[PDB]
Amino acid sequence: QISVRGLAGVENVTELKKNFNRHLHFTLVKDRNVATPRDYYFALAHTVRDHLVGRWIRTQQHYYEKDPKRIYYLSLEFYMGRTLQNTMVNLALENACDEATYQLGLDMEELEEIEEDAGLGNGGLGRLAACFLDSMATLGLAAYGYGIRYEFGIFNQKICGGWQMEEADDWLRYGNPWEKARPEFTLPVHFYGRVEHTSQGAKWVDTQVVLAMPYDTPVPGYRNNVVNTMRLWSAKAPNDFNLGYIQAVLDRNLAENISRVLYPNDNFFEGKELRLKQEYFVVAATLQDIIRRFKSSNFDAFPDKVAIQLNDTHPSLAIPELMRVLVDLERLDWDKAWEVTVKTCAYTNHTVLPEALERWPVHLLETLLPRHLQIIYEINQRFLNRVAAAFPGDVDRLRRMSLVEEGAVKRINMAHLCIAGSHAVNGVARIHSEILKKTIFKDFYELEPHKFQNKTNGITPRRWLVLCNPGLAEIIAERIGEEYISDLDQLRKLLSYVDDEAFIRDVAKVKQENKLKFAAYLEREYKVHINPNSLFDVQVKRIHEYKRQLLNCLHVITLYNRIKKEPNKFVVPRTVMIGGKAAPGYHMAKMIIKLITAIGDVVNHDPVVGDRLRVIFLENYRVSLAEKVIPAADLSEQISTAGTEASGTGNMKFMLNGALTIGTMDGANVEMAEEAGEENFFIFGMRVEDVDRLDQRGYNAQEYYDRIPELRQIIEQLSSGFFSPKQPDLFKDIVNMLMHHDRFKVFADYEEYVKCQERVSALYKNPREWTRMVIRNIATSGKFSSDRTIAQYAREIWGVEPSRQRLPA
Ligand SMILES: CC(C)c1ccc(/C=C/C(=O)NC(=O)N[C@@H]2O[C@H](CO)[C@@H](O)[C@H](O)[C@H]2O)cc1
Ligand SMILES: O=c1[nH]cnc2c1ncn2[C@@H]1O[C@@H](COP(=O)(O)O)[C@@H](O)[C@H]1O
Ligand SMILES: *Cc1c(COP(=O)(O)O)cnc(C)c1O
């Protein structure tokens, strides 16, 4: 149908058809007369998977032969979403399969919707890991993602009476055609026990054993025949475990619970033993795999052949685990082991909020991992001896930099452990990396300035343009060719089309088509009516106070109140869509969801408003829903309090798909505005510097309430029961937080936000100038390819060169 989707050659179409019919018969054990759409989805998935295996076998064989440096990306989350279309895109099979399925009387788009998301992450951190795997394969790096195969990923969100309900994401119920179990490569992991000090070093004994069984998933690079591996570990009881007879068998569940469910609490660190077991499980199994591979080729050259990237502090136990293996098992001297460890490990930080940092109670480590605790203490003593030698007499610095935190309960600060144990520490956007050096890790930067780096985040333009917005990808390809898909900086060529009347028309037409399709998706799946000519104003991300979905809510109420005040006055019509999951125990996030639906309930049924304003809560926001909504958006809401959002990546998704951004100077928004020009961005609100000045003086929300009548009306409406008639005190906790203990200064940015939103509406009334600004954003989005991000990691941290060269097919 369209060029960027590849050729539908007659041999290929014929061959896909027969393999499809073969899988339906032999693999699925069905015939056409009783096959369902799910069976057809699986027959297609197996058909496409067959095309990966040759390239997968020879990629891994290639790495065995050439023995390049291996990159191991350790993460507790890999938010992959669906695999079928992404695989087709990367192998150039999309049009072929579309034709093949069309000739069999089937609609491939309908079959794609049957696939469950692999929802093995919470949001940005998890999705970054997935974009990274795609880029590493695309750039020909010998890279392996290592994680946990959760039986239950991030919960499915249901809204009942406007409240979030959580239900289990049983994503493996119908099977996973992409993974290959490798029970033959199963490895033991130890827990509990005690440490014995013999003549010839320490021994960790009397341990309980859990087996780690790997499952391998192929990661195809974009049209280069490279297929890398994501290996995810599953927990299995040993066969002598607990060995009433019946109860001993039933108690195998206790060991296997390690890989049962992803922790969804992305706001607040809670030290739960089961999460600690998860974090050790992934690290212990992964490092045995790493060492095995290294030996099949003297630990002096270990850092020349291995790099380990720690995604946040979650796999930080890699540091003392590598030290344990090298010292206790391989018998290296401490100093040599430490040199090897530091040169192998690198750490990426994702938040400056102190309640998010992992600080594990010493008593849990003492019980669960007694040897690792001893090693952490030894690391700490040798580290603090260095601090003392560089800053003699600075006793407060010693307590500030310690890996061991004193108090009610002693804790280990895992971020301090990562910095001590890594040759490189990076933030994920320039302003965040600067904040790490100036504030939370200032002492460490002064000790070892060379460790600190910036690697601004990015997104893959395969999933986030070519896959989710083929219409846009095609109209771009028409003018500049297809090479921009693996070299996104080429989008700068589109600056020479900003005054091209045909291109302006095509960009606008693609957005209108995406909006019509999404408006049809909404009505069909959820029975809700929207105006497709309205401005689509969208904020989708996890629900957090720092992200300030509440500030958006206040703007929505302002618009409604303005309409009720002057109903016969023209306003630019809007559909305001907000979506995102709240962590199950985060009461305020749950209250915010209830407030959004409560606003919707009033606004959507007011006959005087009409179709000029609608407020939709987008239920169960996840990767597959992002792929639908982001191409339909006009305005991207990126409105966190300055200094709180480390980077953001949804922001980049919107930029690439033709939405304009309203945002604070926070995270990667700063760099996005720098690339596009501040004139082509709707910047508002306090800068980081302004936030600091307000903190020194003291934030008094009452001041803003006293001075801004429109804000006072909104707060009185919240308090009096305007948005909750039958429960008039429902939102008291929200009002109380806003007035007395708002860490994120919602009222301080309100006036500027509302003004800025008026400038958005003004520009939207001139479709031609709106579209021209859109083109200037799309054309300067190149820097935010995760290919650029990974090439920087490779050159500046891992010490490897990327390659765009094909492997032979
Ligand atoms: C130990 C247990 C309690 C636990 C701790 C943390 C998490 C999840 C964190 C997460 O989901 N973090 C996250 O998504 N960060 C975002 O990382 C993105 C990629 O760098 C950034 O763009 C965002 O700014 C950052 O908030 C889950 C469980
Ligand atoms: O002893 C060997 N002989 C031949 N090929 C090997 C041997 N060991 C590893 N390989 C190759 O490398 C492996 C890749 O799997 P991995 O070692 O689990 O990453 C196999 O798939 C082989 O292609
Ligand atoms: C990109 C993405 C995120 C990250 O969004 P932010 O706006 O950067 O927080 C979260 N969830 C999903 C499903 C995503 O695709």
Swiss-Prot record:
Keyword GTP-binding: no
Enzyme Commission designation: 2.4.1.1
Molecular function per GO: glycogen phosphorylase activity; nucleotide binding; pyridoxal phosphate binding
Residues that bind AMP: D31, Y64, R292, R293, F294, K295, S296, S297
Site feature: Can be labeled by an AMP analog: Y144
Cysteine pairings via disulfide bonds: none
GO cellular component, one term: skeletal muscle myofibril
Activity-regulation annotation: Allosterically regulated through the non-covalent binding of metabolites, being activated by AMP and inhibited by ATP, ADP, and glucose-6-phosphate. The activity is also controlled by post-translational modifications including phosphorylation.
Catalytic activity: [(1->4)-alpha-D-glucosyl](n) + phosphate = [(1->4)-alpha-D-glucosyl](n-1) + alpha-D-glucose 1-phosphate
Cofactor: pyridoxal 5'-phosphate
The entry's keywords: Acetylation, Allosteric enzyme, Carbohydrate metabolism, Glycogen metabolism, Glycosyltransferase, Nucleotide-binding, Phosphoprotein, Pyridoxal phosphate, Transferase
Keyword Transmembrane: no
Positions of the record's site feature: Involved in the association of subunits: C97, C131
Annotated positions of the Phosphotyrosine modification: Y192, Y215, Y445
Modified residues (Phosphoserine): S3, S402, S486, S719, S720
Top-level taxon in the UniProt lineage: Eukaryota
InterPro entries to which the protein is assigned, alphabetical: Glycg_phsphrylas, Glyco_trans_35, Pyridoxal_P_attach_site
Top-level enzyme category: transferase
Family: Belongs to the glycogen phosphorylase family.
Known partners and oligomeric status: Homodimer. Homotetramer; to form the enzymatically active phosphorylase A.
PANTHER family documented for this protein: GLYCOGEN PHOSPHORYLASE, GLYCOGEN PHOSPHORYLASE, MUSCLE FORM
Name by which UniProt lists this protein: Glycogen phosphorylase, muscle form
